[PDB]
């Protein structure tokens, strides 16, 4: 299985300056939750963003640097070596990778972040024409989560 994994707002903003434009603990939760001992592809923006690779999990990073060896991460330097990773793999972000492997892989589980951000990355435009919903979720609204959250699942018709 190939899945993308997302957490967009209203607009599809997915990022600002390279960070997250939201604090909200239950999505990271649920990406843990999703890719635990699975596989998460990664662009090298994103990674050094996140800083480090995540534990219990593979973590790729697709990158053109040649000089790009880092402890506890595998590189691919093509998007076609996506599909030699064996098991659940799933597109971690960013924009560009998104862009890359929307039409691509077979299901995407959104997190779809019920406000209006300010963003300088997106996630494309797509349509509930191509995708069945095959689970809608609200997420729990409390003191450390306090924006409502939707967690999608869909599936590509
Ligand atoms: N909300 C979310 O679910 C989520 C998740 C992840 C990231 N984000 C956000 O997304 C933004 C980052 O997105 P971005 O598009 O700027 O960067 P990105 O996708 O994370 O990474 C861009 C880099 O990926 C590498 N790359 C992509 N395709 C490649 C290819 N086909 N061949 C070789 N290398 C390739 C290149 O690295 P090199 O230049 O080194 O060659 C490129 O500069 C940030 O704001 C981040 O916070 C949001
Ligand atoms: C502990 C932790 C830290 C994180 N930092 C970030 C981050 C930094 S800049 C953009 N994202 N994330 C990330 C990275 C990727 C995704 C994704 N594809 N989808 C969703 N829904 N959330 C993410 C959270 C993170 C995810 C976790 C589990």
Request: charged letters at 25%.
């Amino acid at each position: 299985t190939l899945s993308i994994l997302v957490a967009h707002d209203l607009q599809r903003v997915i990022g600002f300056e390279n960070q997250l434009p939201w604090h909200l603990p239950n999505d990271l939760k649920h990406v843990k939750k999703l890719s635990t001992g699975h596989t998460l592809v990664m662009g090298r923006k994103t990674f050094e963003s996140i800083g480090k690779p995540l534990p219990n999990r593979r973590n790729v990073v697709l990158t053109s640097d040649t000089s790009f060896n880092v402890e506890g991460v595998d590189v691919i330097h093509s998007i076609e070596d996506i599909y030699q990773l064996p098991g659940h793999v799933f597109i971690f972000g960013g924009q560009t990778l998104f862009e890359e492997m929307i039409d691509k892989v077979d299901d995407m589980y959104i997190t779809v972040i019920e406000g209006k951000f300010r963003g300088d990355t997106f996630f494309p435009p797509y349509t509930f024409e191509d995708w069945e919903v095959a689970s809608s979720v609200e997420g729990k609204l409390d003191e450390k989560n306090t924006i409502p959250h939707t967690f999608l699942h869909l599936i590509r018709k």
